[PDB]
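Inputs:
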Amino acid sequence: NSPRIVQSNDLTEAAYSLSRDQKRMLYLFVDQIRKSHDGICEIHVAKYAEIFGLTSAEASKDIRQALKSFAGKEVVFYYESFPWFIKPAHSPSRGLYSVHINPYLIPFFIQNRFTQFRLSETKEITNPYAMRLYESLCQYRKPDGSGIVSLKIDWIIERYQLPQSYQRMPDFRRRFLQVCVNEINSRTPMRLSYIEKKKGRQTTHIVFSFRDITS
DNA sequence: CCCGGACCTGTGACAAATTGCCCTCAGACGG
DNA sequence: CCGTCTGAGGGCAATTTGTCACAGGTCCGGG
Ligand SMILES: [Mg+2]
Ligand SMILES: [Mg+2]
Ligand SMILES: [Mg+2]
Ligand SMILES: [Mg+2]
Ligand SMILES: [Mg+2]
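Outputs:
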């Protein structure tokens, strides 16, 4: 059975901007850390390729560029801002990378106030905003596999750090909402629907319902 | 009143970024 | 040693994401 990611809801709801490749790596860090810390984690090229069905070469490319793109990135818990890394990554051995996560982030990674999903649920998603949506939905999932939640549009925009043109609602619909609901429905075992909540002419919330395809 | 104006929607265009692929060649290891 | 399995480089064209102009709906209010 595949690895079970668990994380504090504060991370599920944090404001940050990460790529797909970076989020893939971030899932393993939370896994390494939780299985124990000083904050030093490690990534093997060949294991990454096998986990995500890549070649060794393209794995190397993904790890390398992800790693240098973390520099200057910051995380906000709603507020408090932290850097993800406190030293550049470096490779002691061929095919091996060593990384230094901000140890002050440990408690934000690790009661009842948590989110969980198996890694096989997300590893075919491509768009990182859809990984963010699927994580938020998991946070409200019931044991049996269903749930329903209303997310406010401004809060979606702030937390997922969506780009500026998606403050225009027709672009929000076309390039973020429809695409990410389609991936989830095509790439995960979840079957997802939604409806819009209005106040006057403005659309304010999105109401999500979902069930599991083992029913 | 009835136009111009402030709102809202969707779609056609184009620019910028990301995807999985492809090829080269030296490192690490063992037979 | 050398042949093989790796992975660190350099690239590519086809798709997807991010941006903005313009057509086309509603309601408001003062010349
Ligand atoms: Mg890649
Ligand atoms: Mg209005
Ligand atoms: Mg006219
Ligand atoms: Mg027409
Ligand atoms: Mg008009």
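Remarks. Residues 45-46, 55-57, 59-61, 64, 94-95, 126-127, 163-166, 168, 171, 175-176, 179, 201 of chain A lie near DNA strand C (CB under 10 Å from a C1'). Strands of chain A lie at 4-8, 40-44, 74-77, 80-83, 96-100, 114-118, 147-152, 190-199, 202-212.
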